Amino acid sequence: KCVNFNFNGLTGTGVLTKSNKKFLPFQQFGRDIVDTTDAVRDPQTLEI
Amino acid sequence: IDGYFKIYSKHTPIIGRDFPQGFSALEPLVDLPIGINITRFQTLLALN
Amino acid sequence: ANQFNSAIGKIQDSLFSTASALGKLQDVVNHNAQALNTLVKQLSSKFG
Numbered sequence: 419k420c421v422n423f424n425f426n427g428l429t430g431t432g433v434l435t436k437s438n439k440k441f442l443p444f445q446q447f448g449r450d451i452v453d454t455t456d457a458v459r460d461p462q463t464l465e466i
Numbered sequence: 467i468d469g470y471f472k473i474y475s476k477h478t479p480i481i482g483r484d485f486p487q488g489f490s491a492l493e494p495l496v497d498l499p500i501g502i503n504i505t506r507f508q509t510l511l512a513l514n
Numbered sequence: 515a516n517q518f519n520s521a522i523g524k525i526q527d528s529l530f531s532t533a534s535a536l537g538k539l540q541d542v543v544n545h546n547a548q549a550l551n552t553l554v555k556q557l558s559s560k561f562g
């Protein structure tokens with residue numbers, strides 16, 4: 419759904435879907451080649 | 467940096483005798499905001 | 515007719531393997547994509 423989110427001080431607006439990108443144990447959120455926020459990790463359940 | 471003590475470490479298996487040729491990134495382990503002044507160190511060797 | 519058939523039969527080779535030609539369309543696509551990417555990347559700048 420189209421909502422607004424705030425993850426550990428990272429904010430934005432978009433839709434959130436289940437992904438398959440595997441983050442490293444320490445990486446928090448993923449960015450793109452054009453350097454824009456693309457994928458974030460849920461701080462509670464460590465879900466991507 | 468900025469009063470923080472950052473730890474980056476990696477335990478690479480050895481193929482050979484000493485300093486094998488290869489690449490391996492060092493993932494951070496723990497960040498600690500101490501904020502003190504460091505100029506010298508000395509490694510500790512176990513004595514049995 | 516035989517000379518023309520032989521000449522037309524080598525078109526599919528010299529068009530790609532020899533490079534040279536066929537670079538203008540690739541240059542157009544690359545330039546437009548690069549301009550778009552540079553425009554998007556500017557959003558992360560601080561500008562002071």
Ligand SMILES: *[C@@H]1O[C@H](CO)[C@@H](O[C@@H]2O[C@H](CO)[C@@H](O)[C@H](O)[C@H]2NC(C)=O)[C@H](O)[C@H]1NC(C)=O
Nearest residue numbers: 426443444445446459460461462463464465466
């Ligand atoms: C934040 O606290 C929550 C409290 O629920 C933790 O969620 C639990 O996590 C454990 C370990 O993965 C699971 O077995 C439980 O089922 C979770 N509980 C619920 C209600 O979902 C969460 O792991 C904590 N986060 C961190 C980073 O420690």
Ligand SMILES: *[C@@H]1O[C@H](CO)[C@@H](O)[C@H](O)[C@H]1NC(C)=O
Nearest residue numbers: 467468469501502503504505
């Ligand atoms: C320690 O570093 C801090 C950082 O500004 C500074 O205030 C202080 O004077 C430094 N002390 C020494 C002995 O270098």
